[PDB]
Design a protein around this ligand. Structure first.
Ligand code: SF4
Ligand code: SF4
Ligand code: SF4
Lengths: 292, 134, 439, 134, 292, 439, 292
């Protein structure tokens, strides 16, 4: 609490809980216990869903906080066809504790990250992982002979729009949301993009990312492309996708297809264990060379 | 264990009690089931005694629980219901009597008793469950 | 039909697997308190060796500390006729300062004897070294992030003829978005000069002298813990309450993120508080914020105003130990211990910290733990009302009693509209310099 | 602990209470039993007192719980049922009396009491259990 | 049980539990279930406190036994200002199982060590750790370059009263039980005792041990001394403390301040890992010396 | 407000952290039975090497067993011109007998070739060796407790020129207050003489011969387990029922105290009983103390007079293994196994004991475990009345049934006025000599 | 289910559970829920025992399945003097799910192995470990200097009846089922069989295996033999045992007593760790030999 102590030290208090979650898409959602729709920021908290607010826990230790936050799913609300397709994953929340008589008397209990959401029986139950969720994970590179970065990354900047690299064409023939026909296949090499981002920016799957595989053009530039996984929302054979090119993350495929061999961030040579414990025999090749 | 007295004579109508059998049981969910008992006797398990007399009888009854009672002593019990056999089946009862003539030494099944006053002289207590420990 | 004794089986998995999802260690747990579960941390690396495999992870370090490195792109043995190589040893990531004082397998080799070309590993993407024109320009690797050190025409003659295990003193400045704002020495100095000169000698006042040789490297504790959460991705990190010098911490790759940070929570003792979404990292002190009387606690769950637990005497950690790194001389694993005079009869509880710190400081830390772990025996378990909810999860409560008036720092706040607290006993005088003499 | 007064005189018909024992017990499953007594005494454990008079008697009764009561004081209790022995067995009671003449110092077994109004001047409360702490 | 089997094989038995704990101070305390004060040894067991006696457990394994022993705290009893200050820590108990009709019919169930005491709600609950508590702990020395023993220890005997080493002076100016003024500061060096035993032998804290730090005399031999930790009982500005001198546990501070450098029990030289894998280079200093 | 599924979280920590506070392992648990939790014990040290760091702990041993030692105070390499050192290797603590048969890295070096000065490490506080007058008398260390062995003018010529890993046969007599009372050979002999003499030869009757060469070292099992509780601080220790010879046990520092003792509970099988506060350590036998009929059990919790559990056939340890030390020859890790003839199809369960014992004895022990672990499949879970409470926690019950009359040793007695028992099946014939031939 | 789906998709169904266990001896036992004795194979399932059938569990993982299968023990049934002696250990079950109206409409739920049987209170409770019990166990040889196989094993075939090796003689003097007198002791060496199979093929212990020790003949060929463990069923001083000879599993005892030194399956020499890190000193014996 932040200077509502004058309100709070009195036994007569009226603090009704309320929270907003910001999805990965730009829209937020509103939730409150107050039973009347209220807002203080431009969020318009709705008591139509959400809000059981069960027992936020704390700890000086790096372990996260948690709140299961039982609620309801509906057409205005999360609606669960949105949730199942792949949204609300890294959804960021702030829980508030507003005075409903005066919403300028509020604070934040925690800012969470909403890790595990269990929906069932016409309702949803969503564990609010704490601020320290990212700690507790392994991050590192292991000197492997491929590359290590994605295309947009700072360790390999590319300017991914710099030429006719991206395929901007609108989609037809979505079939089972893994096969995609694509009317405008023609314009690129066969098997040009094999590990790319199928960002779909229109229609049902709005701003949803999949990964391509099997970039094959069968006849007259069809370019039938598979994906690893379902998009989770069916594209409607009229959506617009853009596909960034595919990186095999290898030195040969780096420098040939792309110009950016300088920004490699990989470890091509990496001699081996048997080199390390080897003592130099004075036989055969012992002049300076590639060792490859 | 004592041989002290039977009891106060008075017992109200409702002094219930009958033999209690371990009867360890398996209850197979198929159907019929087997069973066995390790006693070869039966704890007679008398309950629901009631003292009802004047308050002169009460002070010899509350310390009946206390003085020779405590918890763990005999006070041979009189049944209104040396070896007695039961011959009405072709099987047999053949149940022993350690005490003479239906006197069945017991103990009360209570941590406390509860005597009530119902009028200037009326003394009542609702139950004294026993089990006839050997 | 009925259920079996996998009712015990479904009680575990995943009946208890949901818990640690949403959640020597002998002394690690007491120092964090009830707190949270102390993750395995910092088995200190002695005999630093370089393995040339493909499964070792990229190390990271902050300040003057030796790191093993590993082989990437070694050419074939070249016989002059009595051998020669062209190594490249990759130390750590990020832009670093220069690598000095190389010593191989054994004591010491003079860097003037070598032909090494150090590289910062700049995100600026340093070009090829041109010693990899053995490979040629078309396949020359050009490492962006990692800071490799090549070696040129290295005679394998003095150390056998095999490759020796090289170990490198590395100085790495703390980076990250919180570090480039608020610059400390390593770029904040912006030209010091004033070399005292005026030439075995008078170094007895070096620990108190104004000149900054050697200790100019050591990064403030504020930015190193900011570098951890920056690499983990928490940019909402709040660290203005931290006051410490790091002097060469080192955690490897895949060290959980937090387990690298948790070694610092034992050394400098700081809260990692998280009042709000800022995740405030404040240094732990005894500064009392609450002043509760006994009349002002709420009705708890167990229907006791204050349940007070005093831990077992048989487990009080009678003597505590460290495994710090020497940090002044040749960087080697050392150990100091603090022994309580009355009860020295047992309970040795030691842990290993992989950072580097001096000699009087290590006996200061172990002198601090042996005092704290015996102070933190007492824990309190009370509930306080939401009329004063501004007791954040890491604050400390005066807690007036009829008998005592003993302070309590709090942990494991679980409120739901009734703030219920597992405190722990904390005194103010624990967090002081021990003021000991040096080596 | 006090020596203040007996009680208000009125007690309704039904003021029940009798001695207790812990006397924990194992009931050896294949024969008789064996049982231990750690008391050598008995908590008299009187219950079910009822005050029934005018409302003039009530304000001296509600603060009987409050003023000299609180929780932790004596208020010596009168039994309608210095060492007293019980000689009706050849065993003995031999139970002490710290207070004189059946006065059994107690305490109420209640966090709250509950006085009712039954008519313009009728004051009733259904129960005030006691256990006679030493 | 020891020859009460004649009493015990009868179903008519009367064994009432009872136990005595001996504190670290010389006094013992008495506890019984019998509801009448009884004694067999000079202990005078009181039924006013203690004694719920819940479920002593056993095991052939080295793991301890346990008994939580719920009870009551009072002014005659433990009183919890005694307990919180640091007493009853290594308190040794014996639980007995006496016949109250004849207290010469008794045995010991176990002799315990009373590890964890949890007091609350006007009562205390004290886990009785078994006989094997000391097993299960780490004991050892790790070749560290300091010393390893305390001053009174057998591995370094000192005769700690042999001269004007100890400071016997009575206390004034106790303040917050960490700072201690001490009227008789003068008589010793500045910063003489920095790791010593502040045994306080009078008043409230009777026989209570703290450790000193910051031995500084500000003016006219004041000798303001801090401590690491609170004593837990407030000294009353009239108590008598004695402070044994401070050992830095180092070879230089050993032999200079104290004479006992012979009984060192420490490991000063201890070459190092880098010495061990070092092969001898034939350059520079290779003559016999200190290596320091 | 309601509570979350950290109801599972508060069920663990510290809902189950309170338990182990107040409390290969494949075969370790069955031999102790239901008993208690078998602590990790005795990963046997093969390739004994000496590490010169500061974080290795002081070892302890009892009898003739090799120990690595470590370097303390090595001088600089001295070139005669082809090297020379002045080592001091610290073996173990306590007063020891003499160190003979030194062998370095590799096979064997003759101790007559060395200039070593052994030291007992006496509490008498042996003075300086005067080879540390390199350092000088004013800084000469004078080790009280530890038993160091210096080496003088050691030529590093035959083993390379590096320092070789030295390993030392050490004989240490069992000490402690129970050991000085009741003296065994190692001081009890008080002059034996009678050297047989009368001079490849006739050693076929050495295992049965009256002369005491070699086996005079081995300490009785009574005082070594007394030394453990003495070092742990339990002087109330009762050990008159123990009958065994140790012959070179070795646990390191920080080996938990009990985990060093728990290896002996697998070898000699003894109870660690604790009837009273004496903590009686009696050797386990089948000597029946109870003789219960089936009519004489109490009414248990589960309302069954005797719940009898027979363990799974798929986990019976069909073949058992050891990792003992050779104890006669060059002390090396060895292994024997005992294989049950009917079911050899699987369930290998082995463990590692760090003590030293001979060849016929190891096959005797593993022959004993494979019999016992299949006997200890049956466990009984009954309750017996406090009318006979003199059944101590380690006694054995005859337990007459209508079908069987199978003995049961008992564990985990929890009484509260109703002694409830988790027994385990134990036969008398398990505890016998196997009578096997030797190597 | 196997083509009873026509029976099962109707809500009117009548599938009554039933199972057969095959003991290690050749006899099987029958069990059913149907309350009437029924059979489809030659098993004659009896509803007199067994059959509570509580909650068979499953898993794609290698972990076993389980079913506790509460039931009753009786003279027709398991009878528990059979069970305690050592039978029913590796007892193999099949659980069935038969239609009692037509027993040709059935399947197997699982085929189990009945690991843990807990009998008590006049009943038995027997955990049915799943098909994958054998996985999860350690199998291997550790290069130890003895042998590794049993006598009948494929790795050392012996033809154990090839001469007067086996002792076929009928038993007298069974005493406490560990000592066995044996009337026909004479015919063999003293201490001939020290690790053999005491297969007893008649009477109470029918086909029960124990292991011998202490093969000693005291007078006139008595041959008093101990065992490691009890047989669990008392032999009746008239039974017939046969004892295969004893193998010490050692090269000397292999080739001398038995001819089969070829099929050794053991590792006699196995130099050692100290040999491995040894460098060859050029002193003393350095010629080719046994190293023994
Ligand atoms: S190939 Fe080039 S662009 Fe692709 S990931 Fe590797 S470095 Fe980045
Ligand atoms: S300096 Fe001397 S007196 Fe002090 S602890 Fe060390 S050895 Fe003991
Ligand atoms: S000695 Fe021969 S027959 Fe016996 S187990 Fe060994 S290999 Fe097989």
């Amino acid at each position: 609490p932040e200077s509502l102590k004058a309100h709070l030290q009195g036994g007569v208090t009226t603090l009704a809980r309320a929270w907003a979650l910001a999805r990965a898409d730009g829209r937020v959602l509103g939730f409150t216990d107050h039973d009347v729709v209220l807002r203080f920021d431009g969020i318009s908290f709705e008591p139509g869903s959400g809000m059981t607010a069960k027992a936020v826990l704390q700890g000086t230790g790096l372990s996260v906080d948690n709140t299961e936050s039982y609620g309801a799913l509906s057409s205005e609300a999360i609606t669960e066809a949105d949730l199942l397709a792949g949204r609300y994953d890294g959804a960021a929340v702030t829980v508030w504790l507003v005075n409903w008589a005066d919403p300028a008397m509020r604070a934040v209990i925690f800012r969470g990250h909403l890790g595990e959401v269990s929906r069932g029986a016409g309702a949803f139950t969503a564990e609010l992982r704490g601020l320290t969720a990212a700690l507790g994970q392994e991050q590192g590179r292991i000197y492997h002979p491929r590359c290590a970065a994605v295309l947009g990354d700072g360790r390999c900047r590319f300017d991914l729009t710099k030429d006719g690299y991206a395929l901007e064409a609108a989609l037809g023939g979505v079939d089972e949301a893994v096969v995609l026909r694509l009317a405008e296949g023609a314009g690129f090499e066969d098997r040009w993009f094999e590990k790319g981002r199928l960002v779909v920016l229109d229609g049902a799957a709005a701003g949803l990312i999949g990964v391509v595989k099997n970039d094959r053009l069968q006849a007259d530039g069809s370019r039938l492309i598979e994906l690893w996984q379902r998009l989770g929302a069916n594209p409607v054979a009229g959506d617009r996708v853009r596909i960034e090119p595919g990186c095999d993350k290898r030195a040969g495929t780096c420098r040939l297809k792309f110009d950016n061999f300088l920004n490699f961030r990989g470890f091509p040579h990496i001699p081996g264990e048997d080199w390390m414990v080897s003592y130099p025999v004075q036989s055969g090749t012992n002049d300076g060379g590639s060792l490859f | 264990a004592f041989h002290e007295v039977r009891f106060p004579a008075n017992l109200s109508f409702g002094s219930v009690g009958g033999p209690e059998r371990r009867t360890e049981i398996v209850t197979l969910s198929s159907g019929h089931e087997e069973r066995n008992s390790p006693w070869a006797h039966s704890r007679r398990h008398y309950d629901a005694g009631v003292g009802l007399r004047s308050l002169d009888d009460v002070e010899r009854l509350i310390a009946f629980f206390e003085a020779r009672g405590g918890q763990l002593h005999g006070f041979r019990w009189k049944d209104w219901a040396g070896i007695v056999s039961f011959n009405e089946p072709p099987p047999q009862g053949a149940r022993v009597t350690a005490g003479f003539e239906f006197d069945v030494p017991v103990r009360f099944d209570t941590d406390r008793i509860a005597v009530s006053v119902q009028s200037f002289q009326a003394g009542d207590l609702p139950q004294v469950p026993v089990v006839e420990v050997r | 039909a009925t259920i079996l004794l996998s009712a015990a089986g479904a009680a575990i998995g995943g009946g208890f697997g949901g818990t640690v999802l949403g959640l020597g260690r002998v002394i690690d747990q007491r120092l964090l308190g009830s707190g949270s579960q102390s993750v395995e941390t910092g088995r200190v690396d002695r005999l630093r060796l370089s393995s040339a495999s493909e499964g070792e992870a990229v190390g990271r370090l902050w300040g003057r500390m030796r790191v093993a490195g590993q082989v990437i792109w070694a050419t074939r043995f070249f016989e002059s006729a009595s051998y020669s190589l062209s190594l490249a040893l990759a130390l750590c990531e990020g832009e670093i300062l220069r690598v000095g004082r190389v010593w191989a397998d054994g004591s010491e080799i003079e860097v003037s004897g070598l032909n090494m070309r150090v590289y910062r590993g700049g995100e600026d993407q340093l070009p090829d070294p041109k010693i990899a024109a053995v490979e040629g320009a078309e396949a020359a690797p050009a490492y962006r992030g990692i800071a490799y050190v090549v070696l040129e025409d290295l005679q394998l003659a003095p150390f056998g003829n095999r490759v020796p295990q090289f170990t490198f003193e590395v100085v790495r400045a703390a980076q990250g978005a919180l570090a480039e704002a608020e610059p400390d020495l390593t770029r904040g100095l912006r030209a010091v000069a004033l070399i005292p000169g005026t030439g075995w000698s008078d170094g007895e006042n070096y620990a108190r002298g104004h000149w900054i040789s050697g200790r100019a490297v050591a990064q403030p504790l504020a930015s190193v813990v900011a570098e951890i959460c920056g690499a983990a991705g928490i940019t909402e990190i709040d660290v203005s309450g931290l006051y410490g010098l790091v002097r060469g911490y080192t955690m490897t790759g895949d060290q959980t993120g937090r387990a690298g940070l948790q070694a610092l929570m034992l050394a400098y003792g700081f809260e990692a508080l998280e009042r709000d979404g800022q995740l405030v990292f404040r240094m732990r002190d005894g500064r009392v914020a609450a002043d509760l009387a006994a009349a002002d606690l709420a009705l708890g769950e167990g229907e006791a105003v204050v349940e007070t637990v005093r831990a077992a005497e048989a487990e009080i950690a009678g003597r505590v130990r460290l495994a710090y790194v020497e940090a002044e001389g040749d960087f080697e694993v050392k150990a100091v211990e603090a022994v309580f005079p009355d009860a020295a009869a047992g309970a040795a509880a030691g842990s290993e910290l992989s950072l580097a710190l001096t000699r009087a400081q290590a006996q200061g830390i172990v002198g601090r733990w042996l005092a704290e772990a015996r102070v933190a025996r007492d824990t309190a378990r009370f509930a306080l009302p939401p009329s004063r909810g501004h007791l954040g999860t890491g604050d400390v409560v005066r807690l007036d009693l009829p008998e005592g008036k003993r302070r309590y720092r709090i942990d494991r706040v679980e409120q739901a509209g009734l703030i219920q607290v597992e405190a722990v006993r904390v005194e103010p005088g624990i967090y002081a310099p021990a003021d000991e003499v040096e080596d």
